[PDB]
Symmetry: D3
């Protein structure tokens, strides 16, 4: 089936008395990949659309045209995709392109038809998609995981030994506002980003080491923080006014997506 939900924006003052269940409602997407479904969220935090498409038997396309006041999905929007699942393919205005595990794609404004397929149905592909408003059309570009540039950072003393792969980066590509990346924490480290008011971020956590892994994501004003506890393959959206960092009981990975009006804190928490 197809489903897209709408979550509004808030101020720090609004959430200050939200309980645990409300925080989950306004800031957490509890399900992203369901076999045969397209699950999306529309957040008024800069009007990002994010979610997953996991085709099994029929090929799937994001069919929203009139819900956005445009003739087709990408008439005034750009799209970035990373596949965290099995062998699949996306075919763009008729031209098919095979996407391996952890391969990525950027599709620019004005692309008329984008269709997601899975090769193996019992081990389907999991396309994590992020779309943002766009005013200029830029060229489409496949980002093989082989050629994604790896940057090791962190250390063991600070429990943040990870590897950052830059996928959709302004120093390597032209896009309108959208930036995506992918961070793998090495075993024995579980800590990420440890406020920009001119942009915002959304994190999608996955690849939990063992099934009993949980992740604590922190959000809020630096001196008034809250947390949201995450299972595997869930995503949390961070407003501009909020810090964004997390801890896990073990290591994990996550895809981050960023937008705002440009493309470029301290230690006093609570």
């Amino acid at each position: 089936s197809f489903s897209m939900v709408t979550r509004y924006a808030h101020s720090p003052e609004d959430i200050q008395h939200y309980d645990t269940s409300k925080l989950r409602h306004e800031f957490l997407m509890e399900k992203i990949f369901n076999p045969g479904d397209i699950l999306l969220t529309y957040t008024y935090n800069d009007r990002m659309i994010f979610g997953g498409v996991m085709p099994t038997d029929e090929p799937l396309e994001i069919k929203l045209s009139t819900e956005l006041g445009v003739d087709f999905f990408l008439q005034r929007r750009e799209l970035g995709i990373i596949n965290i699942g099995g062998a699949g393919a996306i075919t763009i205005d008729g031209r098919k392109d095979a996407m391996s595990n952890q391969d990525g794609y950027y599709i620019g404004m004005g692309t008329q038809k984008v269709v997601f397929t899975s090769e193996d149905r019992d081990h389907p592909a999991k396309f994590y998609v992020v779309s943002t408003p766009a005013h200029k059309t830029y060229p489409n570009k496949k980002l093989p995981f082989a050629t994604a540039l790896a940057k090791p950072m962190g250390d063991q003393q600070h429990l943040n030994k990870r590897t950052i792969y830059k996928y959709i980066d302004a120093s390597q590509m032209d896009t309108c506002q959208l930036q995506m990346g992918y961070t793998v924490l090495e075993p024995g480290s579980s800590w990420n980003t440890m406020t920009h008011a001119r942009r915002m971020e959304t994190y999608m956590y996955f690849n939990f080491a063992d099934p009993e892994t949980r992740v604590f994501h922190f959000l809020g004003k630096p001196d008034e923080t809250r947390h949201i506890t995450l299972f595997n393959e869930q995503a949390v959206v961070n407003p501009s006014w909020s810090i964004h960092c997390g801890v896990g009981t073990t290591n994990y990975a996550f895809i981050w997506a960023m937008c705002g009006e440009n493309q470029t804190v301290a230690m006093n928490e609570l």
Copy 2:
């Protein structure tokens, strides 16, 4: 003489128990033009910046560079100007251009220096500015009030007899996401946008001015269609209408207002019309 304040976005459920003072603070810009000053707002409703610059003696320029993460103000933004005051002038990267009353200007992305001047100091120009994030450079275009096309609408039976001027309209011009217009109500009429609407892919800012006599007040309605609130406006004040909110107002006398809109599309037939069954 330069000030920019920040207002956040909200959900309908958030404002549901705001008292009057909270409502005014979160949605109303109480002062826009002060002689010699630049007064602006940053709303996280689609990151619009709006406000006024009113040059008297020295020219003024909106010098936001690093507060926005860019090298100059308009490095990733477009700009629209309407002059509601006296004879003034704008100089754009060295090129001077005279702006009489009700003249308007569109400035495209990448324009590096925009400097506002007034010709007569005792009757200064009142530049209402509206800026929105932009990704494509479109050409600058002065919108003379003479050549603004007038469309009369409304009637006396419904108290909405007015004349609409199109200033920055998608059917006349290329812009990234920004639209502006100017609506003047005739005497005896005081109702705007009355069959009311909500569009989910755009948002609007109303700036009320040209009040008839000094005791005029305007009641601006906002909120979900079945849970509406109002804010009482004096002359030269502005209201931010989030997408989930209706936007309409009535005055004790006639008035005028400039509306500025932005969002992810610019098509006008993307609205949900609100039937007259509301609250």
Copy 3:
């Protein structure tokens, strides 16, 4: 076909956090005229009773006795009626009196039987009634629309060109507490009333079927609003302003009481 509900009084700080649904409940009488029914409100704002009686086949009378601790309705109360519907009649302790459209009546304390009938059932009379505590008997009096003094007021620039008709006015009549009038807004005007020692407004005669009236209440610096359909009523406590604006013109009946 008889109903009387009870609404309490509030302070300004009490209503400050009412949502619209609560504001509607506490301050708005959503239904007044239903054919064959008597619909009333009892407000503890000076203990006014207001409502409607719309007789169709059988005659109607407001038979409150022990609910007010008295032997008959008007034992300690005065009553005012305006008929906004069809040809009707009032029978007062046996004497029948014909009431045309927009005719009015004052009924004083001690009157034991007041009985409402309509001539044509298909076009029934719409009796808007208002009762207030009373201590002195004043004579009953028919108020024909012909004899009500009209005062034109307002202008077009301020959108409040109207005509005020006085029916129960202290300068023309004796009553204990009660004052009633009738205001008609001219086409093209919609603003009305643009006091601490209370008023109740009943709006009707909406020009077109999509007409609405926004009624404002609250302390002058902290105002709220209530949206009204045709033939609905709002009660204004002494501490509140009284204002309304409509998408078109309309008419409304006002009833007032207090200490002067």
Copy 4:
């Protein structure tokens, strides 16, 4: 040295979450008698005025004229007076009448000048006044304490052995809407309105005084029968009980209180008794 404060009416739902401090503010008059002052409350509970006048050197009169939309205080109001203090005298449009301790007076509508004096300055008179809106003039009547009819009731088992004095009673005199009485609790018993009640067409105001010893306290109960609250009282304080509320009290020792009532009917049977089933 004159004061009148204004208290509004509430519903049961409104007060349900009042703390102790708000409950006192909304329902309690903490000071009533001050030498040389007139202290009043105006409650929108049937628009009753109650308070005290205690003259020492200069004689006092309640000069509310335009504050009530009338030419003089009693142009549309009734007045009931009881003196709980020293020997004094009140003069009515020129006629002087000496008022001893526990004497009472009823003054009808239209009386233009009422002046309260104290005879001994060091032991002054305490005039507790209660005024209620009035439409008919009824004759003035001195109610000497000698000639007031007493009725003893209650028993020792139920701690409510008392004696009731009727002062302004519909069965002994005509008044517009006002009724007053006076209850003295016997030693060893302290409980008033013991199976309590709610009349929806009348409201009552109780003023407690004559505490046995200086540390006596009275706990006055008010509220809906299933949601009750209480207010802790010192000597010579007053509490206002809405129509929707029960009204009863118990004290640590004996005391006395005068009660004043009004509404739309002067009938004593209209009340709803409450079986002892109440949270």
Copy 5:
């Protein structure tokens, strides 16, 4: 049936805006004696367990072993019993002891099996039990009502004429932290603990019973001395009083109540007594 509910502790500031229904839930045990049942509360106010045991046909035992992290109920706890019902008996490690009406028993730490029985089924025994954490074992002691020491106090002037019985009193017996007593009010008096107090290193639980006639009600007051609340009680109900709280009551008629106390000391001198100036 066996039933034990758990109530947490609160601060003064927490209850300040409780409505009536909440106050009942957090502080009142509405049912204690039901034939054939064991009804208990565990309050995080010093971890007191109190309730009733009412055997009718089969004998009853409080078999909390692993629910408390111990091998048997009294492994780290002491127990106090007063019988307010018919002739019964309790069996202690096989040893039976007859308990008449109003007899009391103390059972010390380490006692492994305590079994409650009733002689007459149609008139069953009502064992009010209070168990408290204990670290030192003291000998078990039957406290007969005949041999209970009586102390009359109070008078009729203050409506508190009563007689106090000592049951578990640190001056006649050794216990770990538990003290129980029994107070009966005379006819014509209905006030207990009236010059009231707050001891900060101890807390009390009051259980009201023996109401005079079936329409008796008792108003128990609790809270910070300046922010007082009340709870209306029926017969055979109990209230839990936190350390920060005053505790007292008034009844429409006379009554009786058992009080149980624990804390970190057993000195009756440690109390911050409360003068009548402060609610």
Copy 6:
């Protein structure tokens, strides 16, 4: 410079709408060791007293007698001490005993005088004290760090590699209701109590210190298992965990913490393990 503050208990429902600032106030002791000072808190969770003693020039004694209703501090209480600072000494009923870093002491009920000294003033000793109510006197015992039994646990995959030292342990010594231990996390590990739990018959207090670098912070979690909150801690701060609450923490680097436990059972077996499904 003696200071003891008093904190009350709360129910899970009470804290649910606390902001961060209330949570810090209700649950966190932000300063414990100040040179020359005794800083303690009194919590109504089982009436634990904990805090710090840091003598510089003068020896220090906890001089609480009438504040607790007893003749000397430990008249009805036991005491646990761990030294986290420089070389010091404590003298117990006259007998002096030198206490080096990480040494510990148990002082039982009835000990009359306990006097703290530090040897080097510029590097004073840090006596972290925890006191608990007691009913039986047990012998005093020095718990040297040399003879403290070390138990290594955890792994690197789960980031909880630590060493648990048992100081006051039911399997090595008799105490009334009190356990203290010590946990040192190795470099690269930060999670403590990650197989998490709640015990309903006792409660724990965590005091975190020895942060690796000055920018270390520890996030301590508390609340019902499905409704968790967190508190951010600096070095040498303490958090109080009610029985209904989970207690576990994670840091940006490694650290150490002392835990103290008390309740009605000393048994480790009695915990409800909370699985990894929690919010």
